[PDB]
Structure formats: C-alpha cells, structure tokens
Design a protein around this nucleic acid. Sequence first.
RNA 1: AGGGAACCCACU
Lengths: 49, 51, 115
Amino acid sequence: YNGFTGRKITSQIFIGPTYYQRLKHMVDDKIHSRARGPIQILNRQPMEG
Amino acid sequence: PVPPLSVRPAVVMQGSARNQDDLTHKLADIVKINNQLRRNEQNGAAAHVIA
Amino acid sequence: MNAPPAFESFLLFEGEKKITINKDTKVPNACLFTINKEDHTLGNIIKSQLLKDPQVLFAGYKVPHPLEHKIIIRVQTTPDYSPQEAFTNAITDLISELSLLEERFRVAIKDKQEG
RNA sequence: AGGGAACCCACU
C-alpha cells in the first residue's frame, strides 16, 4: 500500500530480508568547498586536498 | 645565473633549522667547485687536477 | 553536518504563517492554499473531502519537495460558490466525521470491555 | 606564521 494515500499499488512488490553493508565512504568525509584559503609556497596557487 | 629565492624558497621548518631547496644545494656544490678551481689558478697547479 | 533538526518539520519558524491564500489567475474562481509544516496527512484528507463537494470543480494537493514542509492545495468552484467557502466547509465536515467516529469508537470499546 | 618528497591502499 502507498504510504501517502493508503491506496494499494497496482503491481505487487518483491520484498524480503537481504544482508546489506554500510561502506566506509560517507559524504560528510568528502564534502568540501573553498573561497580563498591557503596557497602553496612555490607557486602561489591553492593548496591540494 | 642564480635564480632568486622565490624560485628556490627556503622554508622555516618545525625544527628551527631552515630548509633549503634542491636548487640551493646544487648551487652550493657549484660554488664550492668553482672556488676550488679558482684557487688552483691564482696559484699554479698540475693540469691534471685542473682537468 | 547539514542535517535539519527533526522539529523543523512541524514547528513554525518565527514569522512563518500557517496558511496563505492566493488567487489562481489562469481560470476564474480558483485559489491556491499554501500550508506550512503540514504533509500528506492533512493534504490528502482535505482534498478527498473537497472532491465530495458537488460545487467544487477541481481539488488537488501536492508536496512541492519532500525535503520541505509545505503543501499546496488548489481549489476551483462554480461561480455561485467560493474556494474559501469550500475549504472551510471541507474542514467542518472532516471535524464532524472525526467527532462521530470518536464517539462510536468509545461506545464500541465499552461494549467490548463489558461483554 | 603552514614544509616537501617517496611509497602504499582506496573511490568514480
């Protein structure tokens, strides 16, 4: 049944228990932005990483 | 020509000793050998050592 | 890091209005009701009750974005009627039905408990 | 005021 309206879904749905894994890759360890931060000594371009 | 310091920056490192670029070490070798060779001319020396 | 607080889905922010009314100018006798901090529960019951009204030509609702907490209800009525009137009457009908249902559930519970 | 190189693993 659709949760929003309570109506049945016309097609029947394949459902059951499946072993799932949480991988170490999490968005909060990847998100990054920069607006004029530190720069390299030799060339004066933004730092890496 | 000896490039300016900005081309071969020396960075103040954790250990208080300053860190020198690779170019600076190479220039140091060049200066040492140049000075030695200059010494062996103002006072004559065997052509073998000069070579 | 960017998680919204859970209460954000049902608590009005300072200055935020529960409900706003605008005219739909494409067609006559049509209004859009924007409701803040409500979801499918209210939107669906209100729409279905409005569809029961014979003087309502159009009734529908939507959640523009699941990560936001707004519903929009669009109502068009016949010219002898008003979308504001239809909306008010739909809420009154829903309240009446719920009150009756609560009374009858109380009576049924009492019967079951006695025997 | 803040380094660098090298190497290894991994992601699309």
